[PDB]
Design an enzyme around this catalytic site. Sequence first.
Site, PDB file in Angstrom:
ATOM      1  N   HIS A  84       0.799  -1.221   0.000  1.00 59.24           N
ATOM      2  CA  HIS A  84       0.000   0.000   0.000  1.00 59.24           C
ATOM      3  C   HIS A  84       0.836   1.277   0.000  1.00 59.24           C
ATOM      4  O   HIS A  84       0.274   2.378  -0.092  1.00 59.24           O
ATOM      5  CB  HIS A  84      -0.925   0.016   1.238  1.00 59.24           C
ATOM      6  CG  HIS A  84      -0.080   0.097   2.481  1.00 59.24           C
ATOM      7  ND1 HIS A  84       0.843  -0.903   2.806  1.00 59.24           N
ATOM      8  CD2 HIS A  84       0.040   1.078   3.421  1.00 59.24           C
ATOM      9  CE1 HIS A  84       1.473  -0.527   3.932  1.00 59.24           C
ATOM     10  NE2 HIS A  84       1.000   0.649   4.341  1.00 59.24           N
ATOM     11  N   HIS A 134       1.896   6.776  -0.992  1.00 52.62           N
ATOM     12  CA  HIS A 134       1.079   6.056  -0.104  1.00 52.62           C
ATOM     13  C   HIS A 134      -0.313   6.024  -0.613  1.00 52.62           C
ATOM     14  O   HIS A 134      -0.955   7.055  -0.608  1.00 52.62           O
ATOM     15  CB  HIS A 134       1.141   6.798   1.195  1.00 52.62           C
ATOM     16  CG  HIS A 134       0.373   6.138   2.280  1.00 52.62           C
ATOM     17  ND1 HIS A 134      -1.015   6.060   2.219  1.00 52.62           N
ATOM     18  CD2 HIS A 134       0.794   5.611   3.471  1.00 52.62           C
ATOM     19  CE1 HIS A 134      -1.402   5.502   3.352  1.00 52.62           C
ATOM     20  NE2 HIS A 134      -0.348   5.199   4.115  1.00 52.62           N
TER      21      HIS A 134
END
Length: 154
Positions: A63, A78
């Site tokens: 992620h 992110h």
Amino acid sequence: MWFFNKNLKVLAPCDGTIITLDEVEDEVFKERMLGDGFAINPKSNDFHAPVSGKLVTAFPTKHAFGIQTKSGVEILLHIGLDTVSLDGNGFESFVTQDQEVNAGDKLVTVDLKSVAKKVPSIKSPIIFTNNGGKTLEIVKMGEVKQGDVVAILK
């Protein structure tokens, strides 16, 4: 060209809108606790490298991607918010930690539709976790295409 100075060009990793950190619903990001930069409202699924460097930060959860340029400045991509919680579900990465990448390389593919329900936000932050040349002379805002210049760390 380069004349008495070298800058860092940052690209857009997906299609969408560059928005500000203040438009991010998360203390850590919006407050710039770990650093500065901006964010992105992902229109597309493919997230690409914003610069060239080493995937110094990566994770099983896929992620978040940390890239360290030859200059030592580190920038963090992110995807969305709380995504660590998903334990890597919806993410299909194409990279591994310690891997060297080229700006515009694909990092991962996110099931945005799915992820979007599971988390607070898919707005994805781009922060410089480490700079020195700590100036973003320019951040291009608005509607962009993946691989477009979006900021200069001069």
